[PDB]
Write a protein that binds this ligand. Structure first.
Ligand SMILES: CCC1=C(C)/C(=C/C2=NC(=C\c3[nH]c(/C=C4\NC(=O)[C@H](C)[C@H]4CC)c(C)c3CCC(=O)O)/C(CCC(=O)O)=C2C)NC1=O
Lengths: 50, 159
């Protein structure tokens, strides 16, 4: 009488985004892309950025 | 860069290389930015030439000394016209990508010329270096690297 398949239990993954290691290499490479001199606009505005 | 690639593949018996076609493609892609740099240098002709010439006379007062060549209003006007000519050739070289317009209009026989005119070569070169510094201060940063490296060719080729 008991129900054979009641529902489908949602199962969680064991990798979220910290792996996949050039999505993860991209997190890093691009986070460090911001603070390297970005030469597109005049140079005098780019020595005065903390 | 098309003329130089064509004559280089002309010296050999073969066609244009895939590498050279990549060079032409990258030159086309950067050509619009080079036209922007030419736009800025065309519109800043006056003050760039005057600031560079006055920086030259600050560095080298021998030319405007009365024993020097650029003594007097007319002689110093021709001095500023020479700096104008060289800035014009620098804009041509920035647009073309070659230095063959700079070379065959203003580099190739300039030593014998300025020897026969009595004019020192090194002061011309210092004035073009002052032009390089002024146009480097006017433009965007790596854009100024682009402009100042053609200026650097003119400076190294004059000496
Ligand atoms: C586009 C390539 C190109 C260049 C470079 C060029 C130079 C040039 N410079 C001249 C004179 C001159 N050039 C100078 C130059 C200088 N004063 C100095 O001490 C500095 C080192 C230098 C400034 C850069 C002076 C003082 C004269 C007058 C000399 C004279 O009248 O005898 C003359 C003779 C008069 C004239 O026709 O203007 C020419 C043809 N002509 C050209 O077609």
């Amino acid at each position: 009488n008991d129900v054979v398949i009641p529902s489908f239990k949602p199962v969680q993954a064991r990798i979220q985004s910290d792996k996949t290691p050039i999505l993860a290499k991209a997190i890093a490479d691009l986070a460090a892309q911001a603070k390297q001199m970005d030469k597109s606009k005049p140079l005098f505005i780019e020595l005065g950025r903390s | 860069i098309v003329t130089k690639s064509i004559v280089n593949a002309d010296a050999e018996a073969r066609y244009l290389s895939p590498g050279e076609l990549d060079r032409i493609k990258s030159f086309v892609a950067g050509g619009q930015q080079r036209l922007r740099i030419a736009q800025a240098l065309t519109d800043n002709r006056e003050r760039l030439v005057k600031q560079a010439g006055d920086q030259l006379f600050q560095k080298r007062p021998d030319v405007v000394s009365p024993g020097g060549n650029a003594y007097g209003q007319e002689m110093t006007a021709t001095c500023l016209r020479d700096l104008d000519y060289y800035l014009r050739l620098v804009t041509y070289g920035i647009v073309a990508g070659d230095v063959t317009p700079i070379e065959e209009i203003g580099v190739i026989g300039v030593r014998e010329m300025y020897k026969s005119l009595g004019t020192p070569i090194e002061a011309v070169g210092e004035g073009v270096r002052a032009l390089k510094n002024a146009a480097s201060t006017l433009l965007s940063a790596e854009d100024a690297a682009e402009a100042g490296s053609y200026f650097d060719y003119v400076v190294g080729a004059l000496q």
